[PDB]
Amino acid sequence: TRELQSLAAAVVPSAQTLKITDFSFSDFELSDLETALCTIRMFTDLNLVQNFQMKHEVLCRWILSVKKNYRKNVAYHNWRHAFNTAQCMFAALKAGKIQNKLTDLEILALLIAALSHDLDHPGVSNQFLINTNSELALMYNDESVLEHHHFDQCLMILNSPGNQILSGLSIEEYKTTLKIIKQAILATDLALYIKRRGEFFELIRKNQFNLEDPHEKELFLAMLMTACDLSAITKPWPIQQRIAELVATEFFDQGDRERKELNIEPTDLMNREKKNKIPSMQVGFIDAICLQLYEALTHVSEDCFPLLDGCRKNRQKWQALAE
Numbered sequence: 001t002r003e004l005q006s007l008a009a010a011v012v013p014s015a016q017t018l019k020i021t022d023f024s025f026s027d028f029e030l031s032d033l034e035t036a037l038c039t040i041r042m043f044t045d046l047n048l049v050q051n052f053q054m055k056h057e058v059l060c061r062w063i064l065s066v067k068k069n070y071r072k073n074v075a076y077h078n079w080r081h082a083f084n085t086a087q088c089m090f091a092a093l094k095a096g097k098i099q100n101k102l103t104d105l106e107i108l109a110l111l112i113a114a115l116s117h118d119l120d121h122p123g124v125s126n127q128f129l130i131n132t133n134s135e136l137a138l139m140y141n142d143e144s145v146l147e148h149h150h151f152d153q154c155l156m157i158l159n160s161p162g163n164q165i166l167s168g169l170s171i172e173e174y175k176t177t178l179k180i181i182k183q184a185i186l187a188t189d190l191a192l193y194i195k196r197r198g199e200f201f202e203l204i205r206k207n208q209f210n211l212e213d214p215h216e217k218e219l220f221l222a223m224l225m226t227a228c229d230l231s232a233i234t235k236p237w238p239i240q241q242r243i244a245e246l247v248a249t250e251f252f253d254q255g256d257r258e259r260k261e262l263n264i265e266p267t268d269l270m271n272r273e274k275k276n277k278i279p280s281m282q283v284g285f286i287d288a289i290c291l292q293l294y295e296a297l298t299h300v301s302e303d304c305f306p307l308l309d310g311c312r313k314n315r316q317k318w319q320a321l322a323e
């Protein structure tokens with residue numbers, strides 16, 4: 001217990017005080033307790049607590065359970081990444097003006113999904129799990145293996161005694177919400193983003209994009225999840241550079257495991273010996289994966305431009321190092 005008593009007892013500072021509406025937000029200076037308070041504030045200011053009759057103590061317990069079920073020693077995919085993903089979601093809904101485009105249930109699902117989307121991440125990739133004969137890969141037939149696991153864990157915590165923040169929902173609202181959560185968490189598989197984004201970009205290019213179409217709505221929610229998942233790439237250079245080091249640390253750690261467990265030379269991305277490739281890889285990733293997404297999101301809501309602006313600024317910085 002102990003953290004629950006401290007967390008539950010605390011007066012939760014305002015969103016303005018906590019700076020969580022800012023796209024350029026940094027978690028680095030905050031304690032674990034402070035990030036927990038921020039998370040309560042996100043639920044509160046998105047009209048989720050009273051709307052769905054969440055008990056304060058239960059919400060606090062759930063937040064702590066989510067935090068606890070990240071592996072703190074995994075360099076990047078730990079609680080702070082999940083927290084930052086949820087913070088970007090909050091900022092996008094608020095400053096980015098996405099909130100009024102979505103239903104209450106969608107907002108509820110997205111915030112829960114953001115916080116839960118990498119739960120119990122082992123610090124290695126889907127490909128690694130497949131290649132090391134993971135029981136998870138077998139269970140999920142090699143498809144979005146990690147993300148199926150994150151969803152499993154999400155459900156487990158939601159059903160845990162004392163943590164049931166969705167216990168107040170009606171049977172139909174509960175069904176709807178769980179389905180959105182599943183899709184949102186699965187969407188964070190970059191493989192699924194690459195597979196599905198073409199449709200999204202095409203719809204926008206052809207002036208066919210329609211949020212009132214159920215399929216296009218869920219496509220948009222998947223893209224929004226990815227935008228938040230990759231949010232560190234949009235941050236002020238010092239914040240982005242620090243987080244980029246964590247990403248590389250984790251990838252190189254996998255490479256070490258690959259050499260030992262698979263007797264293979266890792267790809268550049270996973271090869272510490274070839275760490276000189278980082279700036280060029282960062283530029284390539286921003287071009288291939290990031291820019292089009294933040295451009296598209298800004299098309300949907302102009303107020304999301306700061307994410308695009310930040311991404312472009314980071315591209316310039318990396319390219320200066322690379323060339």
Ligand SMILES: CCCCn1ccc(=O)c2c(N)nc(-c3ccccc3)cc21
Binds near residue numbers: 248251278285
């Ligand atoms: C060392 C990274 C090289 C570039 N890179 C290659 C392939 C990837 O799959 C990824 C990735 N998933 N994320 C990032 C990243 C995200 C936020 C902030 C900083 C970086 C980078 C990346």
Ligand SMILES: [Mg+2]
Binds near residue numbers: 118
């Ligand atoms: Mg993930």
Ligand SMILES: [Zn+2]
Binds near residue numbers: 081085118229
């Ligand atoms: Zn993630």
